């Protein structure tokens, strides 16, 4: 097997090419910009409707409605401005580890330990939420499935595979197979043409929703990447791992720009999201509290400590007006 | 204020009442977790009861509703979803006693028990350890000595000794012999007493949970 000799030299060539493009560091460039100061964000809402531990959430493009999944078999659709429950969709399998909100708002989705993330119809006659489709075909727990549009949806399962679906058809039109560990997160680019995804091999990748080929491959973590989130510009993305370290990567330089680590932080990250502008890096940890990293100088700005258990999900509204955190405490805070 | 939002608040309160009502129905149920290494008798204990990622199995015995989650159909990293089954009432564990001479699979089952017994989530969760295929263990214990999987066996190669040796080798894997229990039962196809044994262990676990709730324990 002399073909593996090409792989080693190829990896060295990749590491050398990006090393030559590493002129300066993001710390040196942003060493001449004023910091963001202490960012004190207090709780505005508390959404108390779940009985088990909340495992996921996702805002709507209206930045007012948010879905949330939990292990008690319910998928509630909150109204954040008034804490009202707009729907409460009972799931056929209470082991749900992800949920999504269609950009238009006519559908939601949720999957888990049943290898299926099923699309629910919100805007329909008969005034009840009804399962539109049940997208089966994965061979492992579904960790994240996000909506491209009302008719397509990308998933990412525990069988080291991400797949692009067609809701009206129900068949994987494109399957992305390049990972060696199981995929644990996912995030769509603003233009919804590329997307990155964590894994359990400390390697996030970059795919194309139309071609299906792995564009680039980023590494540098020491443990399983738990979360991921695209920079609002679409040319960078942060990650979250079990080594208690977030790091902003870069699709242009093909390498990480900086790393957000603290000495008194030892628990893994479960959730990562940016802000509307892109200066804040909201990261939810197993320490029961969500930290706030200034995403340009890598200094901890503030702390969002209001949960009584591990924070498992995190989302920032599409207008940046609020930050919703959901913990195993069964409560879903909304900061501002 | 609240012109048409009064009816929205009323609908929210109605589905909140429905959530509270559906959460009490799922609290009076006993959730188990059927683990076990491959090729174990775990597919037969589901049939000993009343009975594609995980397959729930709902059944009722003596006015007690059991839910048994068989998670063997997921050949992925257990580290990344084993926290979903936290707070489960008990952990059933099927171990084939007739696999001590097949392939060192008994040591695989032993290390699996050590991993899902000293797990950071199942510290207080009791374990109902079953030992299936007792008849095949009977038939294969007289000719195949225990020295294959346990060469340090100092004793007679009879059933009442070697079976108890396996029982104490499995029971000597929890470093929390004060907080958690391990109910062992040399099950078989005899008289279907497995449901009664699971009911007894689950009743003890429920008594302990009630004691923790009322502040006594």
């Amino acid at each position, epitope marked *: 097997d002399q073909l593996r000799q090409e792989a080693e030299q190829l990896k060295n060539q990749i590491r050398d090419a990006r090393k030559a493009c590493a002129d300066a560091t993001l710390s040196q460039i942003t060493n001449n910009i004023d910091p963001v100061g202490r960012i004190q964000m207090r709780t505005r809402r508390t959404l108390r409707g779940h009985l088990a531990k909340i495992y996921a959430m996702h805002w709507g493009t209206d930045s007012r409605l948010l879905v949330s999944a939990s292990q008690d078999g319910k998928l509630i659709i909150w109204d954040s401005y008034t804490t009202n429950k*707009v*729907h409460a969709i009972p799931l056929r399998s209470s082991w749900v580890m992800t949920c999504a909100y269609a950009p238009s*708002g006519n559908y939601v989705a949720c999957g888990g330990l049943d290898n299926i993330c099923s699309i629910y119809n919100l805007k329909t006659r008969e*005034g009840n939420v009804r399962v539109s489709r049940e997208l089966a075909g994965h061979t492992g727990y579904l960790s994240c499935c996000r909506f491209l549009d009302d008719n397509q949806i990308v998933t990412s399962s525990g069988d080291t595979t991400c797949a692009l679906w067609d809701i009206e058809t129900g068949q994987q039109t494109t399957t992305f197979t390049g990972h060696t560990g199981d995929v644990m997160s996912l995030s769509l680019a603003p233009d919804t043409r590329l997307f990155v995804s964590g894994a359990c091999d400390a390697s996030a990748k970059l795919w194309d929703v139309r071609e299906g080929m792995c564009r680039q491959t980023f590494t540098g973590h020491e443990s399983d990447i738990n979360a991921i989130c695209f920079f609002p510009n679409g040319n960078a993305f942060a990650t979250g791992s079990d080594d208690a370290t977030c790091r902003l990567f870069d699709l242009r330089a093909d390498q990480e720009l900086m790393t957000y680590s603290h000495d008194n932080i030892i628990c893994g990250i479960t959730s990562v999201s940016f802000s509307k502008s892109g200066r804040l890096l909201l990261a939810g940890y197993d320490d029961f509290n969500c930290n706030v990293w200034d995403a340009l100088k890598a200094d901890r700005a503030g702390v969002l400590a209001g949960h009584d258990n591990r924070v498992s999900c995190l989302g920032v509204t599409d207008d940046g007006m609020a930050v919703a955190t959901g913990s195993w405490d069964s409560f879903l805070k909304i900061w501002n | 204020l609240s*012109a*048409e939002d*009064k*009816a929205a608040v*009323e*609908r929210s309160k109605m589905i909140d009442r429905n959530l509270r009502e559906d959460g009490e129905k799922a609290a009076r149920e006993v959730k188990l977790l059927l683990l076990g290494a491959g090729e174990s008798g775990k597919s037969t204990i589901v049939k000993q009861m009343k009975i594609t990622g995980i397959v729930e199995t709902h059944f009722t015995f003596k006015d007690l509703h059991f839910k048994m989650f068989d998670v063997g159909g997921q050949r992925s990293e257990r580290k990344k979803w084993i926290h979903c089954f936290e707070g489960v009432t008990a952990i059933i564990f099927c171990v084939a006693l007739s696999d001590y001479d097949l392939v060192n699979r008994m040591h695989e089952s032993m290390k699996l028990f050590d991993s899902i017994c000293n797990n950071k989530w199942f510290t207080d969760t009791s374990i109902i350890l079953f030992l299936n295929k007792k008849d095949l263990f009977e038939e294969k214990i007289k000719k195949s000595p225990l020295t294959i999987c346990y060469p340090e066996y100092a004793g007679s190669n009879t059933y009442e000794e070697a079976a108890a040796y396996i029982q104490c080798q499995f029971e000597d894997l929890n470093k929390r012999k004060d907080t958690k229990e391990i109910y062992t039962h040399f099950t078989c196809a005899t008289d279907t007493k497995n449901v009664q044994f699971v009911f007894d262990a689950v009743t003890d676990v429920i008594i302990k949970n009630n004691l923790k709730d009322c502040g006594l324990f």
Partner: single-chain antibody
Amino acid sequence: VQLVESGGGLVQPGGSRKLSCSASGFAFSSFGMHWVRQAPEKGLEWVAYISSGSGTIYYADTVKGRFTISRDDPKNTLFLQMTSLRSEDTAMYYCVRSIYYYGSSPFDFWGQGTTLTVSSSDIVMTQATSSVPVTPGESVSISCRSSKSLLHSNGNTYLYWFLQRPGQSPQLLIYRMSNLASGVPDRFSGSGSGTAFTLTISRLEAEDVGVYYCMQHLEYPLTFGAGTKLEL
């Protein structure tokens, strides 16, 4: 979706009669139901309303005490037990459906209606032009002025627009003054602000003949308008 009523006929004044609206085709238990009557040659008029779970009931100022309303969720039936009828209650009684959450379209589906005949502080909507002529292809502009600013503090200006074609029941066109109803062509478009509303129709087509009522849903009792009729 279906809403059929039954219990119509001639009734002597002072008597009693029960109207039953039997729903079939939707989750009746989750919709708040209304009763809306219409005199033989007058506009619509609100009567009663039950919420989901019967936890809230309202009546008008003419049927309070006389009429009582009730729902049977397991049987999917809506009742209006009428007592002490008068010579003014002669009207077709419509069974209306209405669900209330963020982004809902209440008053979406209207029933067919009975033909009950009895032998012998509110908000006032005003539709000035009670009847105007119109030719296909032309643009119409119906107006409806309220006696109180409907624009609420949360931004939602509650004003609904209905269309009752000749021979049918009124269907929903616009809800909350801006939102088109499902299954309604994009020709219709509501505009206006508080106390001054308008329903502009562009590139008019056939089957648009009928009466156009403007209901306010700011507070009970809900009030309709006189109704502008379009003549060919």
